[PDB]
Design a protein around this ligand. Sequence first.
Ligand SMILES: [Zn+2]
Ligand SMILES: [Zn+2]
Ligand SMILES: [Zn+2]
Ligand SMILES: [Zn+2]
Ligand SMILES: [Zn+2]
Ligand SMILES: [Zn+2]
Lengths: 76, 76
Amino acid sequence: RLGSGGGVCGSVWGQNDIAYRCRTCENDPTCAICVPCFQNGDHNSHDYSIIYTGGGCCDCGDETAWKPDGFCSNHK
Amino acid sequence: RLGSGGGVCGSVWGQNDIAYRCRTCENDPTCAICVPCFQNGDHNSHDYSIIYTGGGCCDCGDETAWKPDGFCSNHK
Ligand SMILES: [Zn+2]
Ligand SMILES: [Zn+2]
Ligand SMILES: [Zn+2]
Ligand SMILES: [Zn+2]
Ligand SMILES: [Zn+2]
Ligand SMILES: [Zn+2]
């Protein structure tokens, strides 16, 4: 998808991987971030969930997919 | 974003790149495909447009972003 450039997390998911959904930081229901990005950010009382994904990429740092307050440390 | 795996086009866009939007094959307004995927597929009377993108990735082959009839040859 289009999205922003700059300091976004490359990470890509293969067929038996884990990501995190966060209904609080997300722009739409298919946004997700990789495990390190979630744990290196602050989501304490957000409505997050674990997801076993078979594909996609981490939305961390891309403000067209993820609220910037939900970025982890290494992505602004 | 989440999306599908398998035979999807990796391609990623940097800060002065070209992609194609196709309002006909797209699932939502931010979907886009890279130049080779567009030209190796069939979009003759679709409502496509050129876009100078600064970021994102090609949606070709990912049926959660792009109608499969709009895939190019090398992605099913
Ligand atoms: Zn990440
Ligand atoms: Zn991150
Ligand atoms: Zn969150
Ligand atoms: Zn492509
Ligand atoms: Zn393609
Ligand atoms: Zn098309």
